Amino acid sequence: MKKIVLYGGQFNPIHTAHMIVASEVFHELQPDEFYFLPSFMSPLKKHHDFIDVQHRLTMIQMIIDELGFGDICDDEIKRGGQSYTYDTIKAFKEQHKDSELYFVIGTDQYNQLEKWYQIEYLKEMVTFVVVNRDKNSQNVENAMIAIQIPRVDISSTMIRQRVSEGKSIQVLVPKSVENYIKGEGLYEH
Amino acid sequence: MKKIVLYGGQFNPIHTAHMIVASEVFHELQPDEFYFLPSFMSPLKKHHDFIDVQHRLTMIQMIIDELGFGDICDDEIKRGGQSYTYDTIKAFKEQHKDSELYFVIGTDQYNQLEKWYQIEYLKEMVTFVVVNRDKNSQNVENAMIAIQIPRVDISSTMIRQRVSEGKSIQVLVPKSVENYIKGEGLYEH
Numbered sequence: 001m002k003k004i005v006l007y008g009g010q011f012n013p014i015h016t017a018h019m020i021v022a023s024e025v026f027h028e029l030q031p032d033e034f035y036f037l038p039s040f041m042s043p044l045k046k047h048h049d050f051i052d053v054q055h056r057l058t059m060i061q062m063i064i065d066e067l068g069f070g071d072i073c074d075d076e077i078k079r080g081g082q083s084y085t086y087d088t089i090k091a092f093k094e095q096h097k098d099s100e101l102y103f104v105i106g107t108d109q110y111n112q113l114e115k116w117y118q119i120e121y122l123k124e125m126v127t128f129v130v131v132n133r134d135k136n137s138q139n140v141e142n143a144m145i146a147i148q149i150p151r152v153d154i155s156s157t158m159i160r161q162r163v164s165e166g167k168s169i170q171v172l173v174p175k176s177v178e179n180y181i182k183g184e185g186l187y188e189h
Numbered sequence: 190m191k192k193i194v195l196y197g198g199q200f201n202p203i204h205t206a207h208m209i210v211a212s213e214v215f216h217e218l219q220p221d222e223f224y225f226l227p228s229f230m231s232p233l234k235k236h237h238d239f240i241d242v243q244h245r246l247t248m249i250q251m252i253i254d255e256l257g258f259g260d261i262c263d264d265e266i267k268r269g270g271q272s273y274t275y276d277t278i279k280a281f282k283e284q285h286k287d288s289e290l291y292f293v294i295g296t297d298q299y300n301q302l303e304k305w306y307q308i309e310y311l312k313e314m315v316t317f318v319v320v321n322r323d324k325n326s327q328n329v330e331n332a333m334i335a336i337q338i339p340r341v342d343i344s345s346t347m348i349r350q351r352v353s354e355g356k357s358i359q360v361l362v363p364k365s366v367e368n369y370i371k372g373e374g375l376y377e378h
């Protein structure tokens with residue numbers, strides 16, 4: 001009966017398009033809880049210049065402070081290794097029986113979902129919520145939920161690329177995160 | 190030799206994509222001055238539900254506060270009527286000779302520049318600076334400047350439409366503008 005939304009990501013760093021996704025899903029679904037779920041290492045991704053965990057969590061808290069909703073689920077950081085969503089959700093669900101689970105992903109992840117670990121079991125445990133990325137609308141099958149957001153082409157890779165070349169990231173992240181990155185020397189080469 | 194940028198708009202309301210445009214242009218061209226230039230009534234657009242002029246100026250100043258650069262140029266508000274850019278620039282330039290003038294527009298205005306008043310004369314007085322809108326890349330002729338920005342599909346129409354239907358505009362405008370719209374009851378029906 002309780003509605004719980006989880007939004008998974010490497011969040012390296014979290015940015016203004018992640019904020020728009022979270023805001024739109026939260027206001028459309030009106031869940032009882034909303035969790036940002038930072039991975040330790042997200043599968044299907046290379047983890048190069050691994051800054052460590054405290055920095056990523058701090059910037060996610062700065063987003064929550066500004067949005068005025070949300071919590072961090074640190075299960076994946078505690079577990080370490082490759083962060084397979086099926087392992088996360090199996091454990092989360094038995095700590096929160098009697099609630100409906102919603103897992104938010106963008107278009108890029110939706111299109112490679114057959115490559116996720118234990119995907120047939122995970123699709124029975126959560127309702128996937130898919131937001132449009134690099135296009136203006138997203139179609140899904142009737143078992144899933146599509147949420148249409150204003151299209152915003154910002155990525156974490158773009159942010160790290162800019163910082164390394166000395167280009168501004170003003171607006172692309174909130175002011176708090178911008179000053180944190182500069183202040184801590186994150187992504188500088 | 191002094192470099193001056195003007196960024197014209199109806200700004201009804203100013204929003205997060207306008208801030209991205211301004212930030213990208215400012216950091217790329219490093220002008221000596223940067224002016225937000227609000228029109229009274231911009232040509233080639235319908236002006237139904239005309240709010241007080243002071244509301245628009247207040248929201249623009251909140252963007253300036255956040256960005257940390259820029260000033261309002263109120264020339265068109267003082268003049269009233271249809272706000273033809275040729276008239277604006279002819280007057281502005283006779284108060285700022287010895288300066289190079291740059292005028293920022295997005296793709297939609299670029300594509301209809303033949304419909305602008307006295308366009309042949311205006312192209313001699315300013316360098317047009319074009320940012321991509323509704324696409325990822327903008328080509329221009331060699332006399333103009335293209336600045337590539339992260340594509341962000343937010344419009345003022347979107348903002349007004351959301352507000353009227355009771356939909357959230359969180360993140361799509363800054364928090365100060367969001368609370369200002371709500372408290373002044375703007376765009377409510």
Ligand SMILES: Nc1ncnc2c1ncn2[C@@H]1O[C@H](COP(=O)(O)OP(=O)(O)OC[C@H]2O[C@@H]([n+]3cccc(C(=O)O)c3)[C@H](O)[C@@H]2O)[C@@H](O)[C@H]1O
Pocket residue numbers: 007008009010011012017018021037039041042043044045083084085086104105106107108109115116117131132133134152153154155156
């Ligand atoms: N501009 C934008 N517009 C709309 N959506 C945007 C976006 N930028 C990122 N996104 C989305 O936000 C999210 C965060 O992106 P980013 O921080 O890169 O994170 P990402 O590496 O994309 O991982 C997203 C989640 O999927 C999980 N996953 C991925 C692959 C395999 C498996 C498995 O279990 O086998 C699990 C992963 O652990 C994590 O919880 C993603 O869903 C992404 O599509």
Ligand SMILES: Nc1ncnc2c1ncn2[C@@H]1O[C@H](COP(=O)(O)OP(=O)(O)OC[C@H]2O[C@@H]([n+]3cccc(C(=O)O)c3)[C@H](O)[C@@H]2O)[C@@H](O)[C@H]1O
Pocket residue numbers: 196197198199200201206207210226228230231232233234272273274275293294295296297298304305306320321322323341342343344345
């Ligand atoms: N998401 C987005 N991404 C990239 N660019 C975006 C954008 N949203 C708006 N823009 C752009 O920002 C600007 C502000 O938009 P908005 O507030 O609607 O304003 P708008 O009505 O488009 O007017 C822009 C300027 O052009 C002038 N103009 C227009 C037509 C005819 C003539 C004439 O002299 O005959 C003069 C007008 O007076 C004003 O200074 C525009 O350049 C628009 O293209």
Ligand SMILES: [Ca+2]
Pocket residue numbers: 070071
């Ligand atoms: Ca809590």
